[PDB]
């Protein structure tokens, strides 16, 4: 499937778990911001690649992205 | 409809497009004006006017319903059964008419191909024609024996039929032009009447698809909390480009272009060829094309050669005389036309990163304005793409049409 | 009274029963053909669906050919059809060698739409594709044949 | 001569036919 | 109302057939047992697609050959004189 | 602030239910 | 610990008239999901598979062909409804995976006990040229 | 108007060297994408936030200039060719003439010159001609079919592909029958090359029977 | 892995993206499945022969139909008023009026006009009869093999 | 000698083309900027706006002058 890595520019605003049509994403706690949390990527098979989530990064450039790769069934969106 | 102003713009605009076109073919053979019939020039401007008008709000129609459908709709507060069950079953109308458009296309359009084909080869008993394998229209021509036979049988009050394009009736003649006379229909308006049907078809199910569509689908579920009016979903499940219903209309555009753009053509040379001309003192008929509709018009190389080579040049020597007009906005149509395609197969990525290089030059020179420029968005470079096609279109076929007519 | 309702009354399959599907009468008509008789040799189905196909095919043919107006027309009709029959055949050969393997249980369902538990139709195995597909053409040359000599070898007074 | 008669059917039918049937064969073939 | 198990899941996906039928045989034994013993060398999918491969390129080289000229125009040739150039 | 305002104000002139959610309002425009 | 709760099959469906949007062949041959959510009052809401259909009181189930059906769905139950919601995955096999809240609690909160799959520890800026990672089968984003 | 034709020719040089020279030294990265190096150099896009980003993949600038190359060529050899036609002519004062304004070569190069060209056949007979006008027609046609790959984007055709795939599955006599791999639509860099490939081979094929039909029909 | 057997992404691919993609990356080595520079380069150099191979054989092809059913030795004595041919037309579905429209040439049935110019080029490096031009081909096919 | 200068000509175009296009490739996949510092290179990549928009004036210039005295002469 996709890959989704995170970067240490977060700023733990929440914005990108909420954006996800697919529960992909989640917020784990780390102690290197103001927010004392920080995004992860754990379930990345189920991941459609919309990029919905880094409409909503609010950094300078996205503190999480997205790369393309091979594709599945779930992947494609599939229903047949 | 008595709680929302798009339904009822919608069906309005549907009844009024609907009857504009009504209006303009019952306009042509029934000539309300005195010294109208044996203006040709008039006859035809009027005609090809209405037409675009019916199609513009015909589309409208299909776009607002669409409207209606993303914004309105409420099945909590106001739940109607039978939208419910059209939109329980979509998927067997959509699938259903995709299977028509099919069809048609391959045994409307085959036809033609086979018939080149046929003449290419040196084999022109095998074509559908007159002379090789006919197909006639024979239920219109029934419908015109039965017009023409009910005055006196079913319409005892009648004096005359009521127009004079069902075989039976006499020619009239005005100050030396033909006014109207019986339209004779073969094998080459069985072709065409079909061409007509296909392309009507496909529109409607571009349409239909938008608006049924609009609310979700099988790809994007919450596609309606995306609005009526968003470019995609991005590039996942492979490329969500154009899901919307505004994309859906602004596809349906070109088709509806496309349909209408066949029907003046067809009627221009029928009209041309088998009903105006002029007549002698002695009573024959000369049309102006000499009735070449018949034989001309079952290929493609016929329109290509004996409609659109041969009736253009009055425009394109229009130069140094009163018309010469005409002949500049022959040339600048094409320009505006070939200047949309710009818009239409390019992306937005280039065109920024070509403006931050000229921003940059222009920094230099303290010359930066404090509105930072950006490239059109998505959707608005597909709306410019489709304007300026729409428009180089109509106004070369508007010049070409209005340059003929005049000087012959 | 609906005559509309969901399938096997389960309204979250993709599919409707509507009068055209689950009629009485065009449920025994589809039970009938031999395309559904799923406790049949595969040979004996395919005979028939290759005589049915063969005898249709050779009007067209003949009719609408290039050597219609000849006195060759119905020989190059009847070799015409028999290979569009050969190409059919050929396609059906390709295709099952292509969808199933040897050794492996047949995919189709074991289930009855009022529950009762079937044996699996053989027309999904191997052999039972082997077996149509040597049955259809051995149908489709012979309703040809038949065609052919039905027509311009008694020269019966059709049309 | 009749060598134009025995190879432009050839080629233009069934070399394609066995070429499609076999490269068809070869994509689809899965282990 | 309850359309989910999980010791069942022929139903619960759906997967039945709507148009199966299993009566017996009808047709006769004789007309049977003749079709099965006449249309038996075809059954193998192995030599069935060579032979109609052969069959068929053989046929259609044999009738391209010796066609003549009544049913081919190509084969008939130019008749006309024929004409100069520009 | 940027030059998409421009377009946008030309855009969504004759959008009134866009502007306002009241019915009245947007029967008297 | 959060033991996952279990699924009921008894549990009674929502009421609905048919429609062509359900399940398929995928279903039959590869997985489908189950939702179910408990609903104070009988009332209407809107399928995400195009129509309407009523909810019962108490418990529902339902199936659906996709993840991003049921999380739209459970999506639109919190935000309007005010009701909590699980999914699940079944197999064609006979297994049952628990799926969403995993942890228990929605993924917007914090959790202590979660681990950070996929994380760099820099900026996006200090990834490696194309050309270090040639011939070695690795990414520049994956080192 | 060989001065003017000059400065045609000098302004799609330039134009398509922009082009390509921009694709080349972006290709790396730029302001709205600056980690463009490691996404390849064929991609779609990076998604519709940040205002939009189609066609922002260093192989979409290639695939832009191949318009403008067309055109440019285009505009050598009808320079060409008409100059030469109307000096084997013996006329060369028509091209001389005509040539300084946009209508004559319209008129007096396009619709001049194909009057022979179209009649390869007509409803009295053919002659050796014919195969250069079906080339004609077949080349518009191609040329026409890219279009429909050009303008129109994938999402529509998924939508349809949904449906048709419903329709056969639930038809009687035909579900016996079933795919192996599931269909889809054409993907987004697919479409562009299958729409390039279309107008290309269809400009080429109609250029090269015009030109070949208009010289041989009056010089052998 | 089924198809294509040198990327391993595409191989999994279950819907039709699987056949094109294999048929527009075949030729991109260094994005096969473990590669190397010495693969690489090896298979650069067998493709070039493979590209050599190829353009030997074309244009025997050419030699071989002109001198089969060209008229080389008609336009050789008279350059000025004789067309060049090409190859000949064998088309069933030809009809009889375009049989006798193409018979152009020297020629006994239907005929191509060839405005490659060929036989110029032939004429000035010293060729005069069939035989020479037979004689090329084998050589070309030789060259090929 | 009318279809050979065609021919030959529109080969030419898809040449120039594919050389730029693995140009851009090279950029994409084989450039060191660690080995290539300071040189040639580094420089053409260090000022590529000012190249940029330089083709851009010139293309204008041509473009809105030959447009004009074409419009003007018909
Ligand atoms: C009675 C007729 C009628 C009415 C009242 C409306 C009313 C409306 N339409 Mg609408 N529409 C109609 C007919 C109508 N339409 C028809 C027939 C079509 C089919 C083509 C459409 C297609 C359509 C679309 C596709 C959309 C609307 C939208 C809208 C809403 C916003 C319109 C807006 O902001 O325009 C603002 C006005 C303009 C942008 C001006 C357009 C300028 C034109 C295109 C150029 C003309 C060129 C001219 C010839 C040259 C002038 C040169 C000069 C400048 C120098 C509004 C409620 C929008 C909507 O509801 O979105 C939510 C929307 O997206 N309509
Ligand atoms: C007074 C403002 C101003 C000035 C000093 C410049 C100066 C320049 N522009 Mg430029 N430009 C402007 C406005 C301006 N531009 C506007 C408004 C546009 C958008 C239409 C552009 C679009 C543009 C492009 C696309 C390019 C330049 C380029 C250039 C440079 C090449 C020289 C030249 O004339 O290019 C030719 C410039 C034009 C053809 C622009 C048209 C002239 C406009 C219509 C004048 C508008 C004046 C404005 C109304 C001022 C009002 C003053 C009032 C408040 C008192 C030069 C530094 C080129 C360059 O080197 O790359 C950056 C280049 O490629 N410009
Ligand atoms: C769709 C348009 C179309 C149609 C109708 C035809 C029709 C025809 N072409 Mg043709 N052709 C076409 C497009 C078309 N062409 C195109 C586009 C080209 C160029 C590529 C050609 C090139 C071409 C050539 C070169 C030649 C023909 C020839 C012919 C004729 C013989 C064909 C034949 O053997 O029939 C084959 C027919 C069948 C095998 C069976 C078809 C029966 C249909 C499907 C009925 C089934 C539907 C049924 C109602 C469903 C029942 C439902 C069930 C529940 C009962 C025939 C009149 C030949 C000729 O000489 O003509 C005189 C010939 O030499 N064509
Ligand atoms: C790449 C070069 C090339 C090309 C483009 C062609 C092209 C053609 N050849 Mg050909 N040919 C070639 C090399 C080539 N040949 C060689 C090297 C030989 C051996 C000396 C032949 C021997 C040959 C014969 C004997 C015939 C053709 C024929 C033909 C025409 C019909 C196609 C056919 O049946 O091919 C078949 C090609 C082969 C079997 C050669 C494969 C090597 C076609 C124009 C036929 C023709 O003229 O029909 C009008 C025909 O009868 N060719
Ligand atoms: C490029 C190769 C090629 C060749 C050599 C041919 C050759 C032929 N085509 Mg054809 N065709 C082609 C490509 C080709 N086509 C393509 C690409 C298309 C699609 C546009 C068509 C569409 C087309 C149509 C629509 C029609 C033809 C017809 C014909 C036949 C002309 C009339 C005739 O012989 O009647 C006499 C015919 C016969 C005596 C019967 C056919 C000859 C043999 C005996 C049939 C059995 C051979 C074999 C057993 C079966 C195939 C084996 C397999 C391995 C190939 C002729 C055999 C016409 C025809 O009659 O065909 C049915 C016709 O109507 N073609
Ligand atoms: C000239 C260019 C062109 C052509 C040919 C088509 C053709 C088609 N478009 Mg289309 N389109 C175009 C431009 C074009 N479009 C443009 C510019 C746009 C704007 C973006 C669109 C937008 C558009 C939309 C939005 C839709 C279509 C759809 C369709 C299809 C209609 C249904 C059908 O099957 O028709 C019949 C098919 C034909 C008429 C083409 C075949 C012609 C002959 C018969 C070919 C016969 C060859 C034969 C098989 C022999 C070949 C054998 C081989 C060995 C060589 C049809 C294939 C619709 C669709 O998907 O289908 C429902 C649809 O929804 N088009
Ligand atoms: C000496 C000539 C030559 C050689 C050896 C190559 C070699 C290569 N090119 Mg290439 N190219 C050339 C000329 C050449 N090109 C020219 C003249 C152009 C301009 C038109 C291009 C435009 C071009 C592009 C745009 C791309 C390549 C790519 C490639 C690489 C993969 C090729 C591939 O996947 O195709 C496999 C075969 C096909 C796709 C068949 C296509 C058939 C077309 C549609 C019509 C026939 C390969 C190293 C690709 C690459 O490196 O990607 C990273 C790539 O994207 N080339
Ligand atoms: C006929 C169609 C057409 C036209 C006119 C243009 C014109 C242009 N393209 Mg272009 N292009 C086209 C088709 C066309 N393209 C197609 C089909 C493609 C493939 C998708 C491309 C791809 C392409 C690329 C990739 C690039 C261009 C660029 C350019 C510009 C640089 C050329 C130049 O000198 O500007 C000459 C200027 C003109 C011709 C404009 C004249 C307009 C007049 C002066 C307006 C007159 C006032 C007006 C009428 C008053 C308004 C009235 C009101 C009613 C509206 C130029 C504006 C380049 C660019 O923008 O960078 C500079 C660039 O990078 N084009
Ligand atoms: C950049 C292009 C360009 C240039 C350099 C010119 C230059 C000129 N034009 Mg001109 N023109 C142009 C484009 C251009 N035009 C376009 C695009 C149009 C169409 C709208 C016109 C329409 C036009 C008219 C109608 C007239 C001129 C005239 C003139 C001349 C004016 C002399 C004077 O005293 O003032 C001058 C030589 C005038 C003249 O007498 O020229 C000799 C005149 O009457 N022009
Ligand atoms: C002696 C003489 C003379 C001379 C002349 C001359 C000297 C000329 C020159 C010319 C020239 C001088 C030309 C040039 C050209 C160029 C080009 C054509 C370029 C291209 C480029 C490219 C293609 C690039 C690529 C790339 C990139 C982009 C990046 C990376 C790298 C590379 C390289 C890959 C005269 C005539 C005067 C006179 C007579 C005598
Ligand atoms: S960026 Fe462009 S191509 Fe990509 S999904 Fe959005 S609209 Fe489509």
Redesign the interface.
Same mark, same amino acid.
């Given at each position: 499937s996709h890959s989704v890595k995170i970067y240490d520019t977060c700023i733990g605003c929440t914005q990108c778990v909420r954006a996800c049509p697919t529960d992909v994403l989640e917020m784990i706690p780390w102690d290197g911001c103001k927010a004392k949390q920080i995004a992860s990527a754990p379930r990345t098979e189920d991941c459609v690649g919309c990029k919905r989530c880094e409409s909503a990064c609010p950094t300078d450039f996205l503190s999480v992205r997205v790369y393309l790769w091979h594709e599945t069934t779930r992947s494609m969106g599939l229903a047949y | 409809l008595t709680?929302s102003?798009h339904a009822q713009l919608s069906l309005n605009l549907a009844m009024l497009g609907s009857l504009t076109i009504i209006v303009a073919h019952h306009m042509y053979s029934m000539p309300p004006y005195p010294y109208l019939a044996t203006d040709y020039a008039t006859q035809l401007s009027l005609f090809t006017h209405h037409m675009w008008i019916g199609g513009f709000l015909i589309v409208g129609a299909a776009a607002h319903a669409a409207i209606f459908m993303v914004?309105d709709y409420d099945?909590?507060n106001r739940?109607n059964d039978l939208l419910?069950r059209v939109?329980?079953? #979509?998927?067997?109308i /959509?699938?259903?008419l995709?299977?028509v458009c099919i069809f048609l296309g391959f045994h409307s359009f085959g036809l033609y191909i086979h018939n080149?084909?046929m003449?290419?080869?040196?084999?022109?008993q095998?074509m559908f024609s007159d002379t090789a394998i006919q197909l006639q229209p024979v239920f219109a021509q029934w419908i015109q024996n039965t017009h023409a036979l009910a005055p006196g049988v079913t319409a005892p009050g009648e004096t005359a039929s009521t127009s004079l394009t069902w075989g039976g009736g006499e020619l009239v003649a005005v100050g030396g032009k033909v006014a109207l006379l019986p339209i004779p229909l073969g094998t080459a308006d069985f072709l065409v009447h079909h061409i007509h049907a296909f392309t009507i078809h496909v529109t409607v199910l571009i349409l239909l698809?938008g608006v049924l569509?609009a609310?979700? =689908?099988?790809? /994007?579920?919450?596609k309606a909390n995306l609005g009526f009016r968003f470019?995609?979903?991005?590039?996942? #499940?492979? %490329?969500?480009?154009?899901?919307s219903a505004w994309?859906?209309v602004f596809?349906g555009l070109?088709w509806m272009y496309n349909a209408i753009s066949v029907v003046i053509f067809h009627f221009s040379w029928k009209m041309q060829s088998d009903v105006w001309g002029s007549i002698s003192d002695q009573g024959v008929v000369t049309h102006i094309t000499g009735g070449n509709f018949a034989?001309?018009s079952i290929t493609?190389?016929?329109w +290509? #050669?004996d409609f659109l080579?041969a009736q253009? =040049?009055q425009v394109?020597?229009s130069?140094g005389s009163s018309l010469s007009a005409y002949? +500049?906005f022959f +040339?600048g149509a094409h320009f505006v036309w070939a200047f949309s395609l710009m818009f239409?197969?390019?992306? #937005? %990525?280039?065109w920024?990163?070509?403006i931050? =290089?000229?921003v940059?030059?222009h920094n230099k020179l303290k010359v930066a304005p404090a509105?930072?420029?950006?490239? +059109?968005?998505?959707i608005?470079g597909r709306a410019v793409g489709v304007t300026h096609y729409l428009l180089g279109g109509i106004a070369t076929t508007w010049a070409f049409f209005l340059a003929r007519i005049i000087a012959v | 009274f609906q005559v509309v309702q969901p399938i096997n009354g389960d309204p979250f399959i993709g599919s409707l029963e509507t009068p055209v599907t689950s009629s009485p009468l065009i449920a025994w008509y589809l039970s009938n053909l031999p395309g559904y008789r799923t406790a049949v040799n595969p040979l004996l189905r395919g005979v028939e669906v290759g005589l049915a196909h063969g005898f249709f095919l050779v009007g067209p043919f003949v009719k609408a050919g290039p050597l219609r107006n000849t006195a060759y027309a119905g020989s190059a009709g009847s070799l015409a059809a028999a290979g569009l029959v050969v190409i059919l055949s050929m396609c059906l050969t390709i295709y099952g060698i292509s969808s199933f393997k040897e050794g492996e249980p047949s995919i189709a369902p074991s289930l009855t739409l009022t529950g009762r538990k079937k044996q699996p139709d053989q027309l999904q195995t191997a052999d039972g594709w082997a077996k149509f597909t040597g049955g259809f053409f051995f149908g489709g040359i012979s309703g040809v044949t038949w065609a052919y000599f039905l027509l311009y070898v008694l020269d019966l007074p059709y049309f | 001569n009749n060598l134009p008669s025995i190879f432009v059917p050839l080629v233009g039918l069934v070399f394609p036919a066995i070429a499609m049937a076999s490269l068809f064969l070869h994509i689809q073939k899965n282990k | 109302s309850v359309y989910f198990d999980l010791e069942d899941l022929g139903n619960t996906t759906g997967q039945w057939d709507v148009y199966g039928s299993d009566a017996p045989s009808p047709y006769n034994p004789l007309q049977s047992k003749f079709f099965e013993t006449f249309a038996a060398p075809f059954t193998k999918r192995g030599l069935l697609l060579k032979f109609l491969i052969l069959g068929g390129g053989s046929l259609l080289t044999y009738v391209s050959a010796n066609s003549t000229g009544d049913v081919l125009p190509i084969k008939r040739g130019p008749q006309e004189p024929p004409k100069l150039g520009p | 602030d940027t030059t998409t305002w421009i377009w946008n104000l030309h855009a969504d002139a004759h959008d009134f239910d866009s502007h306002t959610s009241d019915l009245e309002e947007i029967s008297r425009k | 610990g959060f033991t996952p709760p279990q699924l009921d099959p008894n549990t009674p469906s929502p009421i609905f008239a048919g429609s062509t949007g359900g399940l398929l062949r995928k279903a039959q041959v590869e997985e489908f999901y189950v939702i179910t959510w408990n609903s104070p009052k009988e009332q209407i809401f809107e399928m995400p598979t195009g129509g309407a259909a009523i909810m019962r009181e108490g418990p529902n189930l339902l199936k659906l062909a996709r993840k991003e059906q049921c999380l739209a769905l459970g999506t639109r139950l919190r935000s309007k409804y005010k009701i909590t919601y699980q999914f699940y995955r079944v197999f064609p096999n006979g297994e049952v995976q628990y799926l969403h809240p995993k942890d228990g609690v929605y993924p917007e909160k914090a959790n202590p006990g979660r681990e950070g799959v996929g994380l760099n520890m820099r900026s996006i800026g200090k990834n490696v040229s194309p050309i270090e990672v040639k011939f070695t089968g690795k990414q520049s984003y994956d080192l | 108007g060989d001065f003017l034709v000059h400065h045609a020719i000098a302004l799609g040089l330039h134009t398509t060297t922009l082009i390509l020279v921009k694709g080349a030294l972006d290709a790396r990265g730029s302001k709205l994408m600056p980690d463009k190096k490691d996404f390849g150099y064929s991609f779609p896009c990076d998604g519709p936030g940040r205002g939009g980003t189609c066609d922002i993949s260093a192989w979409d600038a290639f695939y832009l200039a191949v318009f403008w190359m067309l055109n440019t060529i285009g505009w050598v050899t009808f320079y060409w060719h008409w100059k030469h036609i109307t000096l084997w002519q013996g006329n060369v004062s028509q091209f001389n003439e005509s040539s300084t304004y946009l209508m004559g070569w319209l008129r007096d190069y396009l619709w001049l010159n194909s009057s022979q060209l179209i009649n390869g056949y007509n409803p009295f007979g053919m002659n050796s001609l014919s195969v250069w006008a079906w080339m004609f027609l077949f080349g518009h046609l191609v040329w026409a079919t890219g279009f429909m790959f050009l303008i129109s984007w994938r999402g529509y055709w998924q939508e349809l592909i949904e449906t048709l795939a419903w329709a056969h599955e639930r038809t009687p006599l035909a579900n016996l029958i079933r795919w192996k791999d599931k269909p889809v639509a054409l993907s987004i860099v697919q479409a562009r090359l299958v729409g390039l490939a279309h107008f290309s081979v269809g400009y080429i094929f109609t250029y090269a029977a015009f030109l070949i039909a208009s010289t041989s029909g009056k010089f052998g | 892995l089924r198809f294509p057997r040198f990327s391993q992404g595409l191989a999994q691919d279950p819907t039709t993206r699987r056949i094109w993609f294999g048929i527009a990356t075949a030729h991109d080595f260094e994005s096969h499945d473990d590669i190397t520079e010495e693969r690489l380069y090896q298979n650069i150099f067998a493709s070039h022969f493979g590209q050599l191979a190829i353009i030997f054989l074309w244009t025997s092809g050419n030699l071989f139909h002109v001198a089969w059913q060209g008229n080389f030795e008609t336009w050789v004595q008279d350059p000025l008023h004789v067309r060049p041919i090409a190859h000949a037309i064998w088309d069933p579905h030809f009809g009889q009026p375009a049989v006798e429209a193409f018979t152009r040439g020297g020629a006994l049935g239907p005929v191509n006009i060839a405005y490659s110019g060929v036989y110029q080029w032939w004429y000035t490096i010293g060729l005069r009869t069939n035989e020479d031009l037979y004689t090329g081909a084998l050589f070309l096919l030789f060259l090929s093999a | 000698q009318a279809a050979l200068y065609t021919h030959h000509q529109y080969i030419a175009g898809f040449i120039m083309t594919g050389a730029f296009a693995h140009g851009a490739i090279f950029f994409i996949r084989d450039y060191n900027p660690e080995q290539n510092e300071d040189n040639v290179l580094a420089r053409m990549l260090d000022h590529k706006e000012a190249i940029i928009s330089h083709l851009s004036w010139a293309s204008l210039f041509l473009g809105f002058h030959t447009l004009g005295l074409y419009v003007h002469n018909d």
């Open positions: - | 709680t102003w914004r099945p909590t739940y419910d939109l329980r079953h #979509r998927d067997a /959509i699938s259903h995709n299977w080149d084909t003449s290419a080869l040196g084999r022109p095998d698809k569509f609310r979700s =689908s099988r790809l /994007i579920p919450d470019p995609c979903d991005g590039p996942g #499940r492979g %490329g969500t480009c154009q899901v994309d859906h596809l070109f034989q001309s493609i190389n016929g +290509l #050669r080579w253009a =040049s394109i020597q130069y002949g +500049l +040339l239409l197969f390019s992306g #937005r %990525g280039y920024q990163e070509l931050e =290089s000229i940059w030059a509105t930072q420029p950006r490239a +059109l968005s998505i608005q | - | - | - | - | - | - | - | -």
